[PDB]
Design an enzyme around this catalytic site. Structure first.
Site, short mmCIF file in Angstrom:
data_model
loop_
_atom_site.label_atom_id
_atom_site.label_comp_id
_atom_site.label_asym_id
_atom_site.label_seq_id
_atom_site.Cartn_x
_atom_site.Cartn_y
_atom_site.Cartn_z
N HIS B 28 0.46 -0.97 0.13
CA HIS B 28 0.02 0.32 -0.37
C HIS B 28 0.93 1.45 -0.06
CE1 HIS B 28 -3.16 -2.62 1.20
NE2 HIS B 28 -2.14 -3.42 2.57
N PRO B 116 -5.58 -5.46 11.76
CA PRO B 116 -7.14 -5.85 11.62
C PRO B 116 -7.50 -3.68 12.75
CG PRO B 116 -5.84 -7.50 12.34
CD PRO B 116 -4.65 -6.81 12.21
N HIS B 261 -4.44 3.47 -2.95
CA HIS B 261 -4.33 3.16 -1.65
C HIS B 261 -3.40 1.68 -1.53
CE1 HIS B 261 -6.01 0.89 1.80
NE2 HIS B 261 -6.58 0.11 0.94
N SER B 383 -20.99 -9.91 38.57
CA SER B 383 -21.17 -11.46 38.37
C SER B 383 -20.16 -12.02 37.96
CB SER B 383 -22.10 -11.28 36.37
OG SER B 383 -23.19 -11.27 37.10
N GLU B 410 -16.45 -5.41 25.63
CA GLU B 410 -15.54 -5.95 25.43
C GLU B 410 -14.82 -6.08 24.47
OE1 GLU B 410 -19.19 -6.54 25.00
OE2 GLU B 410 -20.03 -6.98 27.12
N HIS B 472 -27.99 -15.70 25.51
CA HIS B 472 -26.85 -15.78 26.92
C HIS B 472 -26.78 -17.28 27.91
CE1 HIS B 472 -28.89 -11.95 26.76
NE2 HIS B 472 -28.07 -11.68 27.82
C1 LIG Z 1 -11.24 -4.91 10.27
C2 LIG Z 1 -10.43 -4.66 8.77
N1 LIG Z 1 -11.46 -4.74 7.78
C3 LIG Z 1 -10.79 -4.63 7.02
C4 LIG Z 1 -9.27 -4.54 6.42
C5 LIG Z 1 -8.67 -3.73 5.31
N2 LIG Z 1 -8.75 -2.52 4.87
C6 LIG Z 1 -10.14 -2.43 4.10
S1 LIG Z 1 -10.28 -1.02 3.58
C7 LIG Z 1 -9.13 -0.18 4.33
C8 LIG Z 1 -7.85 1.07 4.51
C9 LIG Z 1 -8.52 1.69 5.99
O1 LIG Z 1 -8.13 2.79 6.36
P1 LIG Z 1 -7.92 4.46 4.33
O2 LIG Z 1 -7.92 4.80 5.86
O3 LIG Z 1 -9.43 3.39 3.75
O4 LIG Z 1 -7.25 3.75 4.00
P2 LIG Z 1 -5.37 5.01 3.42
O5 LIG Z 1 -6.69 5.97 2.35
O6 LIG Z 1 -4.82 5.98 3.81
O7 LIG Z 1 -4.73 4.25 2.61
C10 LIG Z 1 -8.38 -1.70 5.22
C11 LIG Z 1 -7.13 -1.76 6.16
C12 LIG Z 1 -8.45 -4.53 7.73
N3 LIG Z 1 -7.21 -4.75 7.40
N4 LIG Z 1 -9.30 -4.68 9.25
C1 LIG Z 2 -23.13 -7.18 24.43
C2 LIG Z 2 -23.53 -7.77 25.59
N1 LIG Z 2 -22.37 -7.00 27.17
C3 LIG Z 2 -23.60 -7.80 28.53
C4 LIG Z 2 -24.04 -8.30 28.72
C5 LIG Z 2 -24.63 -8.27 30.07
N2 LIG Z 2 -26.07 -7.19 30.51
C6 LIG Z 2 -27.42 -7.74 30.32
S1 LIG Z 2 -28.53 -5.77 31.10
C7 LIG Z 2 -26.74 -4.49 31.30
C8 LIG Z 2 -26.50 -3.76 32.32
C9 LIG Z 2 -26.21 -2.61 31.46
O1 LIG Z 2 -27.15 -1.37 31.66
P1 LIG Z 2 -28.21 -0.99 30.99
O2 LIG Z 2 -28.11 -1.20 29.58
O3 LIG Z 2 -27.77 0.83 31.01
O4 LIG Z 2 -29.79 -1.07 31.66
P2 LIG Z 2 -30.64 -0.44 32.66
O5 LIG Z 2 -29.90 -0.11 34.12
O6 LIG Z 2 -31.27 0.76 31.45
O7 LIG Z 2 -31.84 -2.26 32.87
C10 LIG Z 2 -25.32 -5.63 31.01
C11 LIG Z 2 -23.93 -5.52 31.71
C12 LIG Z 2 -24.85 -8.22 27.48
N3 LIG Z 2 -26.38 -8.16 27.36
N4 LIG Z 2 -25.48 -7.85 26.09
#
Ligand SMILES: Cc1ncc(C[n+]2csc(CCOP(=O)(O)OP(=O)(O)O)c2C)c(N)n1
Ligand SMILES: Cc1ncc(C[n+]2csc(CCOP(=O)(O)OP(=O)(O)O)c2C)c(N)n1
Ligand SMILES: [Mg+2]
Ligand SMILES: [Mg+2]
Lengths: 663, 662
Positions: B28, B116, B261, B383, B410, B472
């Site tokens: 690139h 990535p 690119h 939990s 996460e 879950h």
């Molecule tokens: C998660 C992920 N999806 C896709 C790719 C492959 N890919 C698609 S578009 C792109 C470039 C993203 O950066 P950009 O701003 O488009 O780059 P530039 O024009 O500066 O080269 C890449 C690496 C990757 N490396 N990782």
């Molecule tokens: C991706 C993901 N991570 C974790 C959970 C577990 N989970 C369920 S509710 C919750 C609390 C998030 O708070 P919020 O959504 O603001 O709840 P509210 O007080 O409105 O009930 C979590 C961590 C989930 N359901 N999905």
């Protein structure tokens, strides 16, 4: 326009939710307590939806991204005449129509299966996507055949997840105006107060995405919410309403705290909360006839009349635009055009074509023959070959366009394909690199839990990718996807196999399909077409040899089948009996009869060898105790693809050495 | 001051990158060409980094989240003296130290592996988090033993990814002031122009996150970039600098396109581009000695003086705070205190406890005895039982706090754990539910590729979760993880197994560890402690029986081991010989001598059967052609957990029925 009766309905919903959770000794009281006013206002004053007529194609699509508030939804669905009080009384119990997190196909009215946070929001973006595209294709002057809104109720956990950022960017860029989000902002999460990990302006963020923003200062003020929804409905961008609520409202000792989020109140606190609501503590699961009546006279009749007027408009649409009307009915049914396969590409011997290029040819055919086909790539259409070159791009100015530019938003793309499939009228697909399937693996799981006719094109499947290095070369992704129940993971061996895999992906109404394709030119195999169609549909079929029980049985998938065949010839040239079997789809093969399974892979053959350029995991089922697996046990390398493949054992001579050295 | 010699340096960097991509016929050019000025300005004028002393602990950590700009980095590393020209002459070739995307531990001075998208940015967040926590723990009055910045070069794709949203939210909420992002805003992506999928206001977005924003309008203006970086270092929040650059600047016909690119320029366009740069198109791989001299006088001299002062400050530290200096050095060495495991919990016969609870008991012991322990949960610490109850929470006001609150983030959390592992001085850990391990799977993969001592606590592992339901309830996560090369997936059977699993997790200096724990109470088994400590380390060991070849060999992981044991006994009193085997870690078992593997799982036993509440995939390797796999080939159910477990076949009677049917 809101009375004490409307408040009685709201507090009835709350009491019902918590009596449900109290019976189960399991559930989430907080969000149903805090969100009941806005949900009531939405359903009774705006939502064109009858949970009894669950399949009205121009119905408004409401999604509860915060699946843990399932009780509220169920309570709503009960007072609207589709769900019995007994199912509520059987909450989170075996076989119930009221599972803990809302599930599609199990409960009527639950449009998508929610629970994993953020995914409901991105699927709602996908639903609105489907709406805009279908309207762009079908609608005419005075024939708004597709015209409905997409509502979603989300929480803080939804907006802390990056898939919300991805989906909101995509929605704002394409000006999905009919998408309205109701954000329950309770400043609380499971582990405590939101100011421990979250501190950001939803306003400035979503306005930067291109959205409109509305703030509701009191979530209990039904009138403020009603105005927010109406304004949001009259606007040109996607819109989010930050309804400010107190989690566990009504509870004296547990309101505004994490404790009411996911644990039952208890009869003491339920009693005190009921006192605050003005309801009899001693009476449980009680709904006034006024409450049922209100939903009968507002939402149900409105939705019935909308459906009736839509049916009339369609009866006239069929007269003025007949062809479009037939195509639209076929789209709603999900059926595929008769003899569409007859226009799919035939690859002849002497062709050396990458599975991605042959997929591109088949896609050129499918866009012509199947008018419901819709999808795109995550900024990799040049590398994935997922573009329809005879078609325009989807946009706000061209909603009819059949190519989507998802951007580097893979997770949101997967959830959007899932929402499109849940909407109906479309055959949706999304494309990326196989190694980045890991990004959208939750989406895939939901696709397999709901049983969505979504197709996921994954190119660049192996170390043959080459110079891009181990980060861009898959090793373990095939096994992870093969472990997902109800997931058609088809890795075609040549172009003809790719055509039949596309057919499986289109006709699989209850099963999502991942297509694992290659970037390196694959050799077309001398297997007649009959056998290819049958064998790809049955998962595994013999490509070389006639002896059911040979000395050597070689199993292969994708890029390896030709190589396997090559090895077979040399074995035959040195007095060894051998059969070569291609296994495109393990799911299909495990769906077949024991007779077919033992005809293709007899367990009587002890020297069974598999060859795949991926992880060994799962192959010992098919080689047995005395068989061998030639695979990749480590990560890849940055070097030209031919060289990497040769260094990793996948040369004919090494297969010969391994096979002849075995017992 | 910026001379025309500085411009010659920038254009030499461009020419060198173009030549590497030309010789490889892969790579690139675009990001090298467009971001060479800003990279040059940062490296030569601000970065306290010596690539040769790559392990200087207080070095400024630089990350290239846009791995596709690899050539640029390599060119920097060549003009800095760490990388030979002959390595660049083998770009993307077998065995080269110049792979297509930057690889840590394979090339000197690459802090983390990228490629990535978004993951380098989030790992940079994790690096800055480690910096702040170590500074809160060790820094004293006049002894600022941890004081360095984290810089990241990022592209448009890094910001379209949601992990960026998560990590930037975490960093703005926690005022990670020493983090500077340089955003290459070329308005172009791989498939085409950015206006076809992207339209955000980065300034509004990041200022909503709690970040600072600067706009460098001329990506070629080195003084604008220098002032941008100085201001970013002076501000109190994390700062993103939007640098407006032309993708492939200098190419007459390919500039401003997505074609420049990801494709080599071609020799014709190369000649025209070198003419625009004022360079000789005939000479290939040509660096003037002026550029070498610039990098020698600027970054290298400054970095070496930085390190000399740091070493003297550490020597004074050891006099003033001896014990703390020894703990600092042990943390840098990545080592564990001797006899730490002596303070780890012991669970005895009659103890019934969930793997999350015994995990938490162990964790509360670890934080006391192991001072480098750091981590938290993604809003599930209550939990997962990962909270250190005796300790404070991490914040901008209390950076010495040992409990991190990641929120519902996460993927960003896994990437932050990985960045902490890369930084050094920490034993980082993560925690969420097993089902949401898929949210951070790409980060797990890079943990395994890089060989980072990261530990991921995954609780709620089976259909025994219960009423939460199928979405879950894990089924297929165990298999997808076990296929990841260099990933220790440990499913403890009791609490003693959990203690040994934690020991393995902390002693795994080059392999990441995923702990799979249960919400439901597990009974403690009658294996003696030595056998547990040896067997969890060897990955598989016998928990019941004496006959090497019995009629029945039961294999299980975690919750079902006990089940198997009970079944064995009934089997025995119906007149059969049984041996029950626990397999907490497959990665360890495969790593063993075949003699041991046959002693535990002999091929001579035809009636082998596995019981695991997960997918079957992977289990036929150990049960053989004639064995049986009792597992789950579908999704879960919302009901009381025990009811789900019994309805899904995991009772003693169903195992006996299926086993005697065989
Ligand atoms: C998660 C992920 N999806 C896709 C790719 C492959 N890919 C698609 S578009 C792109 C470039 C993203 O950066 P950009 O701003 O488009 O780059 P530039 O024009 O500066 O080269 C890449 C690496 C990757 N490396 N990782
Ligand atoms: C991706 C993901 N991570 C974790 C959970 C577990 N989970 C369920 S509710 C919750 C609390 C998030 O708070 P919020 O959504 O603001 O709840 P509210 O007080 O409105 O009930 C979590 C961590 C989930 N359901 N999905
Ligand atoms: Mg909340
Ligand atoms: Mg760009």
């Amino acid at each position: 326009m809101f009375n004490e009766k409307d408040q009685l309905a709201v507090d009835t919903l709350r009491a019902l939710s918590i009596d449900t959770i109290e019976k189960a000794n399991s559930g989430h009281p907080g969000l149903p307590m805090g969100a009941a006013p806005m949900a009531y206002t939405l359903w009774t004053r705006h939502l064109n939806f009858n949970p009894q007529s669950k399949d009205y194609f121009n119905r408004d699509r409401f999604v509860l991204s915060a699946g843990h508030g399932s009780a509220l939804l169920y309570s709503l669905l009960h007072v609207s005449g589709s769900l019995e009080l007994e199912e509520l009384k059987q909450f989170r119990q075996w076989g119930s129509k009221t599972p803990g997190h809302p599930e599609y196909r199990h409960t009527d009215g639950v449009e998508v299966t929610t629970g994993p946070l953020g995914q409901g929001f991105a699927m709602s973006v996908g639903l609105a996507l489907a709406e805009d595209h279908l309207a762009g294709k079908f609608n005419k002057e005075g024939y708004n055949v597709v015209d409905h809104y997409t509502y979603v109720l989300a929480s803080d956990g939804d907006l802390m997840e990056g898939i919300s950022h991805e989906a909101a960017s995509f929605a704002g860029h394409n000006k999905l105006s009919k998408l309205v989000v109701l954000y329950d902002s309770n400043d609380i999460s499971l582990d405590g107060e939101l100011n421990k990990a979250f501190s950001e302006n939803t306003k400035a963020r979503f306005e930067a995405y291109g959205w409109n923003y509305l703030l509701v200062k009191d979530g209990n003020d039904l009138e403020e919410i009603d105005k927010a929804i109406t304004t949001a409905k009259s606007q040109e961008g996607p819109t989010i309403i930050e309804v400010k609520t107190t989690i566990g409202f009504g509870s004296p000792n547990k309101a505004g705290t994490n404790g009411v989020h996911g644990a039952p109140l208890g009869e003491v606190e339920r009693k005190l909360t009921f006192e605050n609501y003005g309801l009899d503590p001693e009476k449980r699961f009680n709904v006034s006839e006024e409450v049922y009546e209100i939903f009968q006279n507002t939402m149900l009749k409105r939705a019935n009349e909308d459906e009736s007027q839509w049916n009339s408009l369609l009866e006239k649409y069929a007269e003025t635009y007949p062809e479009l009307a037939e195509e639209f009915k076929l789209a709603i049914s999900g059926k595929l055009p008769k003899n569409y396969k007859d226009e799919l590409p035939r690859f002849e011997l002497g062709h050396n074509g990458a599975s991605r290029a042959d997929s591109g040819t088949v896609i050129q055919a499918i866009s012509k023959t199947v008018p419901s086909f819709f999808g795109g790539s995550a900024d990799l259409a040049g590398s994935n070959k997922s573009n329809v070159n005879d078609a325009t791009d989807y946009s706000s100015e061209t909603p009819e366009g059949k190519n989507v530019w998802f951007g580097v938003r893979e997770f949101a793309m997967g959830a959007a394909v899932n929402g499109m499939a849940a909407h109906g009228g479309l055959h949706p697909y999304g494309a990326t690199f196989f190694v980045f399937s890991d990004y959208l693996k939750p989406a895939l799981r939901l696709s397999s839990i709901m049983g969505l006719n979504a197709t996921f094109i994954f190119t660049h499947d192996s170390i043959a990718v080459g110079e891009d290095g181990p980060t861009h070369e898959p090793i373990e992704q095939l096994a992870g996807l093969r472990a997902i129940p109800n997931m058609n993971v088809i890795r075609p061996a040549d172009g003809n196999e790719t055509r039949v895999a596309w057919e499986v992906a289109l006709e699989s109404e209850s099963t999502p399909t991942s297509l694992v394709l290659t970037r390196q030119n694959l050799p077309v195999l001398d297997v007649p077409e009959d056998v290819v169609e049958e064998g790809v549909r049955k998962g595994a079929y013999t490509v070389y040899g006639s002896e059911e029980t040979p000395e050597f049985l070689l199993l292969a998938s994708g890029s390896e089948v030709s190589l396997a065949v090559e090895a077979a010839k040399d074995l035959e040239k040195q007095g060894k009996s051998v059969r070569v079997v291609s296994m495109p789809n393990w799911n299909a093969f495990e769906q077949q009869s024991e007779e077919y399974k033992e005809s293709v892979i007899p367990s009587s053959v002890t020297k069974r060898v598999a060859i795949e350029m991926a992880s060994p995991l799962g192959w010992h089922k098919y080689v047995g105790t005395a068989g061998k697996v030639i695979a990749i046990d480590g990560f890849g390398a940055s070097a030209p693809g031919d060289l990497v493949v040769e260094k990793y054992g996948f040369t004919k001579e090494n297969i010969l050495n391994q096979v002849m050295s075995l017992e």
